[PDB]
Design a protein around this motif. Sequence first.
Motif, PDB file in Angstrom:
ATOM      1  N   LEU A   1       0.753  -1.226   0.000  1.00 44.03           N
ATOM      2  CA  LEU A   1       0.000   0.000   0.000  1.00 44.03           C
ATOM      3  C   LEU A   1       0.809   1.317   0.000  1.00 44.03           C
ATOM      4  O   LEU A   1       0.369   2.318  -0.564  1.00 44.03           O
ATOM      5  CB  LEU A   1      -1.062  -0.095   1.084  1.00 44.03           C
ATOM      6  CG  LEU A   1      -1.916  -1.283   0.706  1.00 44.03           C
ATOM      7  CD1 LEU A   1      -2.994  -1.552   1.719  1.00 44.03           C
ATOM      8  CD2 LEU A   1      -2.529  -0.964  -0.617  1.00 44.03           C
TER       9      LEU A   1
ATOM     10  N   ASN B   1     -10.633   8.962  10.913  1.00 41.16           N
ATOM     11  CA  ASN B   1     -11.186   7.817  11.672  1.00 41.16           C
ATOM     12  C   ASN B   1     -10.856   6.520  10.914  1.00 41.16           C
ATOM     13  O   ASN B   1     -10.480   6.620   9.762  1.00 41.16           O
ATOM     14  CB  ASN B   1     -12.684   8.087  12.083  1.00 41.16           C
ATOM     15  CG  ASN B   1     -13.730   7.586  11.106  1.00 41.16           C
ATOM     16  OD1 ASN B   1     -13.659   7.823   9.865  1.00 41.16           O
ATOM     17  ND2 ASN B   1     -14.662   6.802  11.656  1.00 41.16           N
TER      18      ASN B   1
ATOM     19  N   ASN C   1     -12.699   4.402  10.249  1.00 41.17           N
ATOM     20  CA  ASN C   1     -13.947   4.112   9.671  1.00 41.17           C
ATOM     21  C   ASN C   1     -14.554   2.851  10.191  1.00 41.17           C
ATOM     22  O   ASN C   1     -15.373   2.215   9.541  1.00 41.17           O
ATOM     23  CB  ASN C   1     -13.947   4.191   8.160  1.00 41.17           C
ATOM     24  CG  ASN C   1     -15.358   4.439   7.720  1.00 41.17           C
ATOM     25  OD1 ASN C   1     -16.116   5.178   8.387  1.00 41.17           O
ATOM     26  ND2 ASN C   1     -15.783   3.677   6.734  1.00 41.17           N
TER      27      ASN C   1
ATOM     28  N   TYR D   1     -10.711  -2.454  12.267  1.00 45.86           N
ATOM     29  CA  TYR D   1      -9.706  -2.840  13.249  1.00 45.86           C
ATOM     30  C   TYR D   1      -8.694  -3.817  12.649  1.00 45.86           C
ATOM     31  O   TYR D   1      -9.063  -4.545  11.700  1.00 45.86           O
ATOM     32  CB  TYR D   1     -10.318  -3.360  14.532  1.00 45.86           C
ATOM     33  CG  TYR D   1     -10.820  -2.289  15.508  1.00 45.86           C
ATOM     34  CD1 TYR D   1     -10.088  -1.152  15.826  1.00 45.86           C
ATOM     35  CD2 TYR D   1     -11.992  -2.477  16.232  1.00 45.86           C
ATOM     36  CE1 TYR D   1     -10.534  -0.238  16.786  1.00 45.86           C
ATOM     37  CE2 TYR D   1     -12.475  -1.585  17.179  1.00 45.86           C
ATOM     38  CZ  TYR D   1     -11.743  -0.444  17.441  1.00 45.86           C
ATOM     39  OH  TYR D   1     -12.215   0.456  18.341  1.00 45.86           O
TER      40      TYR D   1
ATOM     41  N   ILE E   1      -8.253  -8.706   9.945  1.00 48.01           N
ATOM     42  CA  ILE E   1      -8.719  -7.363   9.822  1.00 48.01           C
ATOM     43  C   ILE E   1     -10.210  -7.333  10.085  1.00 48.01           C
ATOM     44  O   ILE E   1     -10.910  -8.209   9.621  1.00 48.01           O
ATOM     45  CB  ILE E   1      -8.459  -6.842   8.477  1.00 48.01           C
ATOM     46  CG1 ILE E   1      -6.959  -6.732   8.391  1.00 48.01           C
ATOM     47  CG2 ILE E   1      -9.036  -5.482   8.608  1.00 48.01           C
ATOM     48  CD1 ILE E   1      -6.368  -6.361   7.015  1.00 48.01           C
ATOM     49  N   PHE E   2     -10.745  -6.347  10.784  1.00 46.11           N
ATOM     50  CA  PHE E   2     -12.205  -6.403  10.992  1.00 46.11           C
ATOM     51  C   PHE E   2     -13.025  -5.166  10.712  1.00 46.11           C
ATOM     52  O   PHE E   2     -12.572  -4.002  10.712  1.00 46.11           O
ATOM     53  CB  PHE E   2     -12.593  -6.711  12.417  1.00 46.11           C
ATOM     54  CG  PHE E   2     -12.043  -7.960  12.971  1.00 46.11           C
ATOM     55  CD1 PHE E   2     -10.737  -8.019  13.436  1.00 46.11           C
ATOM     56  CD2 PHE E   2     -12.826  -9.094  13.116  1.00 46.11           C
ATOM     57  CE1 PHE E   2     -10.189  -9.158  14.026  1.00 46.11           C
ATOM     58  CE2 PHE E   2     -12.296 -10.244  13.701  1.00 46.11           C
ATOM     59  CZ  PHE E   2     -10.984 -10.288  14.177  1.00 46.11           C
ATOM     60  N   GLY E   3     -14.321  -5.439  10.603  1.00 49.09           N
ATOM     61  CA  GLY E   3     -15.295  -4.353  10.444  1.00 49.09           C
ATOM     62  C   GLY E   3     -15.287  -3.577   9.145  1.00 49.09           C
ATOM     63  O   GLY E   3     -15.522  -2.388   9.138  1.00 49.09           O
ATOM     64  N   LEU E   4     -15.137  -4.289   8.039  1.00 52.29           N
ATOM     65  CA  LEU E   4     -15.112  -3.667   6.731  1.00 52.29           C
ATOM     66  C   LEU E   4     -16.486  -3.507   6.112  1.00 52.29           C
ATOM     67  O   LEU E   4     -17.356  -4.339   6.348  1.00 52.29           O
ATOM     68  CB  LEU E   4     -14.311  -4.539   5.762  1.00 52.29           C
ATOM     69  CG  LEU E   4     -12.953  -5.016   6.215  1.00 52.29           C
ATOM     70  CD1 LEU E   4     -13.009  -6.520   6.275  1.00 52.29           C
ATOM     71  CD2 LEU E   4     -11.969  -4.629   5.164  1.00 52.29           C
ATOM     72  N   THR E   5     -16.630  -2.458   5.299  1.00 50.26           N
ATOM     73  CA  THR E   5     -17.840  -2.121   4.569  1.00 50.26           C
ATOM     74  C   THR E   5     -17.412  -1.537   3.257  1.00 50.26           C
ATOM     75  O   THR E   5     -16.237  -1.288   3.047  1.00 50.26           O
ATOM     76  CB  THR E   5     -18.758  -1.141   5.274  1.00 50.26           C
ATOM     77  OG1 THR E   5     -17.961  -0.111   5.680  1.00 50.26           O
ATOM     78  CG2 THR E   5     -19.411  -1.787   6.452  1.00 50.26           C
ATOM     79  N   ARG E   6     -18.356  -1.393   2.346  1.00 51.92           N
ATOM     80  CA  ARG E   6     -17.991  -0.964   1.023  1.00 51.92           C
ATOM     81  C   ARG E   6     -17.121   0.226   0.874  1.00 51.92           C
ATOM     82  O   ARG E   6     -16.357   0.310  -0.109  1.00 51.92           O
ATOM     83  CB  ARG E   6     -18.956  -1.122  -0.152  1.00 51.92           C
ATOM     84  CG  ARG E   6     -20.068  -2.075   0.083  1.00 51.92           C
ATOM     85  CD  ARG E   6     -20.946  -2.152  -1.132  1.00 51.92           C
ATOM     86  NE  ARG E   6     -20.276  -1.963  -2.439  1.00 51.92           N
ATOM     87  CZ  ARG E   6     -21.049  -1.674  -3.538  1.00 51.92           C
ATOM     88  NH1 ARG E   6     -22.364  -1.536  -3.432  1.00 51.92           N
ATOM     89  NH2 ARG E   6     -20.557  -1.515  -4.787  1.00 51.92           N
ATOM     90  N   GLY E   7     -17.260   1.175   1.760  1.00 58.58           N
ATOM     91  CA  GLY E   7     -16.475   2.386   1.565  1.00 58.58           C
ATOM     92  C   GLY E   7     -15.190   2.589   2.374  1.00 58.58           C
ATOM     93  O   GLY E   7     -14.696   3.718   2.425  1.00 58.58           O
ATOM     94  N   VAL E   8     -14.655   1.510   2.978  1.00 57.88           N
ATOM     95  CA  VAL E   8     -13.434   1.545   3.658  1.00 57.88           C
ATOM     96  C   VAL E   8     -12.348   1.481   2.645  1.00 57.88           C
ATOM     97  O   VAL E   8     -12.384   0.656   1.765  1.00 57.88           O
ATOM     98  CB  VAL E   8     -13.285   0.305   4.403  1.00 57.88           C
ATOM     99  CG1 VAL E   8     -11.830   0.228   4.936  1.00 57.88           C
ATOM    100  CG2 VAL E   8     -14.329   0.386   5.497  1.00 57.88           C
ATOM    101  N   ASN E   9     -11.337   2.273   2.809  1.00 61.71           N
ATOM    102  CA  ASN E   9     -10.314   2.207   1.830  1.00 61.71           C
ATOM    103  C   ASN E   9      -8.953   1.987   2.413  1.00 61.71           C
ATOM    104  O   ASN E   9      -8.773   1.852   3.602  1.00 61.71           O
ATOM    105  CB  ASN E   9     -10.267   3.468   1.002  1.00 61.71           C
ATOM    106  CG  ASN E   9      -9.983   4.684   1.866  1.00 61.71           C
ATOM    107  OD1 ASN E   9      -9.011   4.721   2.642  1.00 61.71           O
ATOM    108  ND2 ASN E   9     -10.886   5.670   1.803  1.00 61.71           N
ATOM    109  N   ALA E  10      -7.997   2.133   1.525  1.00 60.02           N
ATOM    110  CA  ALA E  10      -6.613   1.942   1.838  1.00 60.02           C
ATOM    111  C   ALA E  10      -6.099   2.610   3.078  1.00 60.02           C
ATOM    112  O   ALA E  10      -5.481   1.948   3.919  1.00 60.02           O
ATOM    113  CB  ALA E  10      -5.758   2.229   0.643  1.00 60.02           C
TER     114      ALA E  10
ATOM    115  N   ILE F   1      -7.182   1.501   6.505  1.00 63.91           N
ATOM    116  CA  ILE F   1      -6.437   0.308   6.816  1.00 63.91           C
ATOM    117  C   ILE F   1      -5.017   0.603   7.286  1.00 63.91           C
ATOM    118  O   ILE F   1      -4.488  -0.005   8.220  1.00 63.91           O
ATOM    119  CB  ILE F   1      -6.492  -0.679   5.662  1.00 63.91           C
ATOM    120  CG1 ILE F   1      -7.760  -1.496   5.758  1.00 63.91           C
ATOM    121  CG2 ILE F   1      -5.321  -1.633   5.710  1.00 63.91           C
ATOM    122  CD1 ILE F   1      -8.216  -1.814   4.347  1.00 63.91           C
TER     123      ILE F   1
END
Lengths: 161, 161, 489, 489
Positions: free
Chosen positions: D312, D328, D330, D333, D354-363, D366
């Motif tokens: 990344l 944030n 977002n 974790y 890695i946790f708690g992802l949704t469509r708009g989480v990005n690089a 992370i």
Amino acid sequence: GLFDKLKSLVSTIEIIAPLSGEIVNIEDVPDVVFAEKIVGDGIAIKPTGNKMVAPVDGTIGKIFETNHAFSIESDSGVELFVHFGIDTVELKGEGFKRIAEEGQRVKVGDTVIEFDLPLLEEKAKSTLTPVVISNMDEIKELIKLSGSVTVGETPVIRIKK
Amino acid sequence: GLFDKLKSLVSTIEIIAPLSGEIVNIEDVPDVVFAEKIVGDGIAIKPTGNKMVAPVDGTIGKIFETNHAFSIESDSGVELFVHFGIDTVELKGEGFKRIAEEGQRVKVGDTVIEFDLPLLEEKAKSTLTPVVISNMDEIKELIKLSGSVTVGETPVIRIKK
Amino acid sequence: KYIVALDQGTTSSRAVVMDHDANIISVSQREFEQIYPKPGWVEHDPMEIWATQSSTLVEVLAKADISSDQIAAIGITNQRETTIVWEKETGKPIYNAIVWQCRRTAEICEHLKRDGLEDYIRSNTGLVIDPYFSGTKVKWILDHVEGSRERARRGELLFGTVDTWLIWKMTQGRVHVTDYTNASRTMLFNIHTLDWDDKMLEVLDIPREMLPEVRRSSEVYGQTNIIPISGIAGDQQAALFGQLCVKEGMAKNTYGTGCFMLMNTGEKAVKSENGLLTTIACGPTGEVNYALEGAVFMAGASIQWLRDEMKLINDAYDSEYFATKVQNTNGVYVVPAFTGLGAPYWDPYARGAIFGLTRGVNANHIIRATLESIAYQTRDVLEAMQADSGIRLHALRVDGGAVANNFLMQFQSDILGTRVERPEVREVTALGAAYLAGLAVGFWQNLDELQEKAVIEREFRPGIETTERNYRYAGWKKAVKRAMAWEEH
Amino acid sequence: KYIVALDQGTTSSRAVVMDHDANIISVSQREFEQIYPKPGWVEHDPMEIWATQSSTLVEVLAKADISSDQIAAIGITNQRETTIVWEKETGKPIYNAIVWQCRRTAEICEHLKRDGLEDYIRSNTGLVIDPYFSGTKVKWILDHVEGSRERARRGELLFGTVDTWLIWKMTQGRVHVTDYTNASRTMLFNIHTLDWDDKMLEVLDIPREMLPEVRRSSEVYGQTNIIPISGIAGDQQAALFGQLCVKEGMAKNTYGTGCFMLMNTGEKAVKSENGLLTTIACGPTGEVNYALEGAVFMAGASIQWLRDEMKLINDAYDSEYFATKVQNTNGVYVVPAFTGLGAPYWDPYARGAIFGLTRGVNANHIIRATLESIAYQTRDVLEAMQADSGIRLHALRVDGGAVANNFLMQFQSDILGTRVERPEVREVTALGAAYLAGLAVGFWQNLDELQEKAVIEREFRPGIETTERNYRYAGWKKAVKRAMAWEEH
Ligand SMILES: Nc1ncnc2c1ncn2[C@@H]1O[C@H](COP(=O)(O)OP(=O)(O)O)[C@@H](O)[C@H]1O
Ligand SMILES: Nc1ncnc2c1ncn2[C@@H]1O[C@H](COP(=O)(O)OP(=O)(O)O)[C@@H](O)[C@H]1O
Ligand SMILES: O=C[C@@H](O)COP(=O)(O)O
Ligand SMILES: O=C[C@@H](O)COP(=O)(O)O
Ligand SMILES: [Mn+2]
Ligand SMILES: [Mn+2]
């Protein structure tokens, strides 16, 4: 059924009650960053109802996303921090309503946020609402008033420099 | 205490027993891809001990990382697949030892893998070791022998084309 | 002479032109913005659906050199569940479109559950308490707008779905209709009675005034100005139809933004006992047929996530390439519950999660894993299907965007231990709508006229790796169980 | 005249040149390859440590224009736990170096546990049953080499640690010694008795023949040909020393490849009851002091992972930049248990997640999350520390590579609600070794000669965001609990 539309009665640094109720010792707050005056110093207030307002003319700085707290710099070079209740960020912004916006210039008194004292009363960890001066060092003297206060009316603190 | 060093007795497509024991009906295998001859066709063998070997002269193709199974193409254009036991990939390669390497040309008989029949006996889901021809269509006829077989000696199948 | 289809997908809006021979003449695609107001939320701009669609249309006609004169009819396919409300006078949304994925009305379901409608809901809608469908979406909307319900009883407020909305925008407001397929998705409609459920409409405080008229998936609903719009069907169901679903026991799997496996149940509405939805499809002339459906929220979108946010790849296509550079995921798993777990899990609280990382896992393991999730999920839904229906598939017919990924396809095959059949034309969803329209216009007369454009392009057969499949799945299962229930309430 | 320090880290090998004034004159760094034979495994090439170190040395001397003539002494610091075995005659490893992170000897511990040495082990080693330390590593090595144990009893086989090995390679084989700090890390050494544990040596079938001689962390051990090597200490402990740990109640946190929080306990070996290790450090003249240590396997390496595998970022440095672009995570974790969870969890089965992802989480969410994990973990270890010791920190002294990240630093501060102090010289670990050597050579005489090079560069004070800290941590806690026990046995 609300006086917002009507005219109200209108009467060194004085910080004006930004919300209402009875003043409490910062030291009284059930959170160390508060009580040990790590974030800074000032008083705390056990609230009476309905709304939080600017305690100094100045510009709003931060407005927490869950808007239960905000910050603001005075036209006199003071940073104040108002944090409704304890751990309130967990409520996830429920009980709150953002009236103002993140960069506004405000007079003492303008509504900053509005809230639901009773949901917050049974949902929140605690209701105490510390009000602290953050730029501790940039200030000379810090005087702490007492008892009851009325929003945008009674002063909670007097400060030197 | 091992004969590896000594000379052994030495005597259409014939597929030679690659491991030893008693021949079993593919249909007997407790796994559909086997039993319904999805991966292909051939026989299965309930093993007797110690080792799996090339069943045709040819070149080893795949050798599973957990080396309990491997594949190989015959010099005659046949793909064979040997899969020790059932679900053996879970054993995580324990009980196994890779003798050969992923690209070797082999004669019938060369050791391909070695193994521990007893750990596998109580660790594995099943011990049956299907042996199948994969390129089903490229072959004309498939004849299935029976009974006991001896590694790198008895033939398990005869095949046309 | 030709038919025209409109495919208004989650990801993008499309437009196809076919001849009598059913030949794909020209296409028009145009992606549109997904919006994420908050965490589990997804929305789209009603006017953008709208816009993107209209435009796509023209652009096609134009592309092929076709005149209103030469187009027999118009077919319409859209994304399911996704809800809209609009002022009657104005032709203006009173809020963005809530998406099928959109987890917002979660609590409401929590009530619905708490009340005890689970049994009811299942029984008459064939659906399951989930923010997936339309009811709660509407309720939430009215509950969040001042002059709402009331404004709606007086009937100033229209309710709709991409079809309902796509139609009314073209028939200048003249036509307020949805089809049978569409409606079943809403939570407000009774599948046995073939009509609006009252107890639903009550419970959720919805006023009939807004519900549109409900009709056969083939019938000229009206005319427009590119003329007659003769077909409407939910995308999933259109694909079913275009694959020539149509007969009891027949099934397809669609790999698009999400994943949907449907199996035609003729005239029997089979009760699911394995987390599948019972729903409506078409019979060979557009008639009400029933079906079992397995819905998976995320499939092709995961790829888009690696594509647009995580930025690991430049094209979805490149995923086959990187994923192949690796042989194994290296022990990594990807539970793509970016918007909950649908079938058969139905946990609107699970959220994405990646698992089993170690120092040497890299980009490529991750991509590959994301691809693989797609097969796992299909497998999950598949098994349910088999149980529910008591029938064992010997092959899987598929279609969709992702179906171009030999890797995924094959991997699907192995992990399944089933043949995978890939149709020669990927654009099946569209074809459905056309057929549905031209039949309805005598453009075709009979489905049999067509038993031939469904030539199979390729078969994917299980490889020797098919042997590992149970090992690999298990971990998958294990992963899933840990993505579940992340979000709180 | 100057001292020279050798810092042979997990990530890379270094070499520092200081004057009497304790001034950092010149440095030589050279990264080296980490190898991953399998999943939870980490190894390094003994000859590469070796090589990289030697070279680093020269290169420095050379860089500053210094002659053997002008160097008073040589100080040595190395990575802990990481085990080596080598043929005596040859000067050749009989296998790569097993790393401290290296989860391979997990089962063995499972025995050790099963037997009941937990109590014993804790009590005399001050350690905890974990593949982290040296015992099992050695055992595994001999158990996996034919002519081993035997070859070792006859004594053809040397055991060692980066210091033991770094020394013997320089004193042409003359010197086979380790220091006190080092040895405590091994699992084979008794902390009260200040010597090899026999019951250990038995249980784990190790033959004394291989163990080297054990000695003060300051003492000329011998001479070499760049001359006298006077100091040796485990890295963590050297940093403790260089921060002027040295007095009861004093503590530092080091942010490098991993993270290590140590607190000096004078002459009292405090028993941990909160997942902390009890261990050895130096007293003001290199004398045995005790200490509480909190070890965290992954910190700066996560960054390297975003750097080298996930790709990344181009530099670790860039992480401050991207992480800041977001405000944030977002909701995301990152449990970086790439090689288990150390303190205070000690689960060699947890793996990354890695946790708690949704469509708009990005690089950027992370990356930021990865940074943040570092603070969470510190916090985790911190609390234990406080409990165990009964003392509340008012500030955190820190040092290390990552400490350059204002973001991380600050974020550390807030999430802690404690001041964070950042020393003006990041290279503290090295300084320790020097001091340890020059004191031992009268190069300095007294630590007080030095109470001044520890000028503080910067203070990080809690911001108003410090208020959220408990909310944020909780999720962290929640995440962790789901990364645990992934791997099976
Ligand atoms: N080679 C490929 N591998 C994976 N996904 C692909 C590939 N090519 C295209 N896509 C994916 O296929 C999907 C397109 O599915 P489709 O049936 O068009 O979309 P929609 O949901 O709009 O109906 C997208 O989610 C896209 O990201
Ligand atoms: N700005 C930064 N942010 C985060 N990590 C950093 C930054 N600059 C360097 N690094 C990280 O700091 C670490 C260096 O720690 P250090 O004390 O040198 O390494 P070692 O483990 O070898 O002793 C590395 O893990 C590196 O990836
Ligand atoms: O559940 C609604 C589906 O029809 C989504 O369809 P889509 O993948 O074409 O957008
Ligand atoms: O536990 C061994 C530690 O000393 C690791 O140290 P390091 O971060 O400098 O490599
Ligand atoms: Mn579609
Ligand atoms: Mn170091």
